[PDB]
Ligand binder design. Sequence first.
Ligand SMILES: [Fe+3]
Length: 463
Amino acid sequence: ELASTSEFRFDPERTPGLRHAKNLTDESTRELERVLEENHSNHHIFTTTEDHKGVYFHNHIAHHDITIWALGANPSTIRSQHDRNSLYQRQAMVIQDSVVKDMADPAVYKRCLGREENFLNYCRFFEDEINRIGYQAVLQKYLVDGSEIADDMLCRIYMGYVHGIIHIGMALEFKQARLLAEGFAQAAVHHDWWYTEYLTQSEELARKQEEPALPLSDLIDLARQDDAIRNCSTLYYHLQKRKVTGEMCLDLEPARDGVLKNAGPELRRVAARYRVDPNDLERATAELQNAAVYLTAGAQRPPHICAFDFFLLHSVTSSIGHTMFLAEPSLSNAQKARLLEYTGRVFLLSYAGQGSPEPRLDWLASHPSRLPNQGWDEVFDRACYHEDDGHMCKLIRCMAHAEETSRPYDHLPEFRVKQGLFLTAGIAAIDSGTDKPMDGTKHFDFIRGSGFKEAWERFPLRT
Ligand SMILES: [Fe+3]
């Protein structure tokens, strides 16, 4: 069903995605296919070595290029945005074809995991697997069939702030086998072991069904009520510097060193209550999308302008992929539920890491629009020109998708974000944007640590 493993092929009618601008052009589509293949062949999946900043920074070019194509970017804009973000990339790894073939021995496949030098080797392995058994059997063998290999990969798609699942979501949404292999390959080369421990232990505990299942929105609220969870982190994770040079680093990591060290049992107890009903997946999927907008767009602080949290917004951008998992006939209801469970448990981990900010939808709702007469089409067009690495446009496109998936459920209490507030959130997001949102890989327009009062000091007061 997907475009070939061996090339990117988009179409404004056949592959426009779940949410997009009105009148997508062939000219823009051809430019997008050119820049994606340049990215695949020339750039690595990580923009930094792990020791530079302490954790890997990720290559967002595939995400950014596709997103601004979907939001109606012209070919000049696609090229400009791609060229600027190319400048800080690492050089692609070498393909060794004998390793690509040897990876069919599960012992070899396992030996290569978590090693970034294998990224293109795994891309080629997953292309070969998709061609051998088809993409649907690949989702079973490498993600949901419950084998040791699929269970291992299911944790890895969340590693590195969920970029594996963002990539996989986008590969399915835009119907690209070449991008699906990239996404499995991205996940295979991560080695953030605490995701494996957290998600495996949370799933084991959930089997006991000790306390009633709750919608994600209610579990976001339960996390804040917990003394250990609400105090488990610190703004210091965003202020730590290297002793010699004073350079920013994440040598301490909020989840590994804060949340799971200080409030492991308490968070696992909350996580264990996010059990999804396999007979109610359209609503449960919409509910997870709404809960991501709730915890992210809600993370506001009077009297400051509306700002979006860089770590929390990965909840919104990852959440879209569950619309594709839902639409996939080859996945069982039980498999689709288990995917939502993992994702929502990671949203709780991420949320606790940023100080569990108390939602202020009242403050978000009163956001004054910088510009008059802004609807989604206006916001989409502005997002095309925003000069970051894609996070602003992905946030805006995935909030617009959530508004649509929430519309059937607007009257239900577990859906905290009601219909008018999604466009308000979108305006708030683009209005927070500046003329110089980045410097190389450094972001300036997003708050880090929204749940700590001191994070807000550099944000202006709403006039
Ligand atoms: Fe990201």
